[PDB]
Design an enzyme around this catalytic site. Structure first.
Site, PDB file in Angstrom:
ATOM      1  N   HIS A  43       0.847  -1.262  -0.053  1.00  0.00           N
ATOM      2  CA  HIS A  43       0.091   0.002   0.132  1.00  0.00           C
ATOM      3  C   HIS A  43       0.809   1.222  -0.048  1.00  0.00           C
ATOM      4  CE1 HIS A  43      -0.410   1.235   4.681  1.00  0.00           C
ATOM      5  NE2 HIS A  43       0.818   0.611   4.214  1.00  0.00           N
ATOM      6  N   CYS A  97       3.721   5.395   5.432  1.00  0.00           N
ATOM      7  CA  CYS A  97       4.017   4.218   6.310  1.00  0.00           C
ATOM      8  C   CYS A  97       5.401   3.988   6.290  1.00  0.00           C
ATOM      9  CB  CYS A  97       3.071   3.123   5.571  1.00  0.00           C
ATOM     10  SG  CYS A  97       3.220   1.693   6.551  1.00  0.00           S
ATOM     11  N   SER A 138      -5.638   5.332   9.855  1.00  0.00           N
ATOM     12  CA  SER A 138      -4.373   5.958   9.673  1.00  0.00           C
ATOM     13  C   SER A 138      -4.267   7.111   8.448  1.00  0.00           C
ATOM     14  CB  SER A 138      -3.718   4.669   9.068  1.00  0.00           C
ATOM     15  OG  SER A 138      -3.543   3.441   9.963  1.00  0.00           O
TER      16      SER A 138
HETATM   17  C1  LIG Z   1      -2.418  -3.246  11.362  1.00  0.00           C
HETATM   18  O1  LIG Z   1      -2.624  -2.095  10.684  1.00  0.00           O
HETATM   19  C2  LIG Z   1      -1.838  -1.746   9.778  1.00  0.00           C
HETATM   20  C3  LIG Z   1      -0.226  -1.863   9.814  1.00  0.00           C
HETATM   21  C4  LIG Z   1       0.427  -1.420   8.766  1.00  0.00           C
HETATM   22  S1  LIG Z   1      -0.470  -1.048   7.569  1.00  0.00           S
HETATM   23  C5  LIG Z   1      -1.963  -1.398   8.340  1.00  0.00           C
HETATM   24  C6  LIG Z   1      -3.297  -1.079   7.714  1.00  0.00           C
HETATM   25  O2  LIG Z   1      -4.000  -1.583   8.289  1.00  0.00           O
HETATM   26  O3  LIG Z   1      -3.224  -1.001   6.610  1.00  0.00           O
END
Ligand code: A1EFP
Ligand code: A1EFP
Ligand code: A1EFP
Ligand code: A1EFP
Ligand code: A1EFP
Ligand code: A1EFP
Length: 147
Positions: A43, A97, A138
């Site tokens: 991603h 990220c 996020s």
């Molecule tokens: C646990 O969540 C994470 C960790 C890295 S990316 C990510 C996501 O949900 O995309």
């Protein structure tokens, strides 16, 4: 039938149908081709001021708005789709990220591990397919399913 998440829709382009996936936010002119225990995805994350952690290796304080983040995502998608830039080059250069250093590769995962919107998009992608903008706490993601 169309595969999970996909709908045929009317574009505003000279009466042409297109296909839209309301799980992945993918859109395309072509009818989509065609669930596994696990998928492997990469991603590209663009964070914004309302991200859970408005901070990344690129920027100690992330101040861009969610709208600005989405415009960035949209532009990356445009460049990926046109071939101007590769998903991996953009992830390595611009993903907020830590996985950026691995060209955005997250490895493989099962249902029940990732943020649900990310999981749902990932498992609705077929190998090789890329999402549209996917929103989580996020930030905004472009997801590429690689296995
Ligand atoms: C646990 O969540 C994470 C960790 C890295 S990316 C990510 C996501 O949900 O995309
Ligand atoms: C605003 O643009 C839209 C919205 C739905 S389809 C479409 C298009 O331009 O084809
Ligand atoms: C297990 O096979 C399936 C079924 C739908 S997607 C998919 C895949 O692995 O790409
Ligand atoms: C146009 O407005 C937008 C676009 C993406 S997020 C957002 C907001 O209002 O937060
Ligand atoms: C998910 O996070 C990843 C993945 C590859 S590198 C890395 C890191 O945090 O350093
Ligand atoms: C990811 O976006 C979030 C999350 C908590 S509040 C908020 C916002 O956009 O205001």
């Amino acid at each position: 039938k169309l595969p999970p998440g996909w709908e045929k829709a009317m574009s505003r382009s000279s009466g042409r149908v297109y296909y839209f996936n309301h799980i992945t936010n993918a859109s395309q002119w072509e009818r989509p081709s065609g669930e596994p225990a696990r998928v492997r995805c990469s991603h590209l994350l663009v964070k914004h001021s309302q991200s859970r952690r408005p901070s990344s290796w690129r920027q100690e304080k992330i101040t861009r708005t969610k709208e600005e983040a989405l415009e960035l995502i949209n532009g990356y998608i445009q460049k990926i789709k046109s071939g101007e830039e590769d998903f991996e080059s953009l992830a390595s250069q611009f993903s907020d990220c830590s996985s950026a250093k691995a060209r955005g590769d997250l490895g493989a995962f099962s249902r029940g591990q990732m943020q649900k919107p990310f999981e749902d998009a990932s498992f609705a992608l077929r190998t090789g397919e890329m999402s549209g903008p996917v929103f989580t706490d996020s930030g905004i993601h472009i997801i590429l399913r690689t296995e």
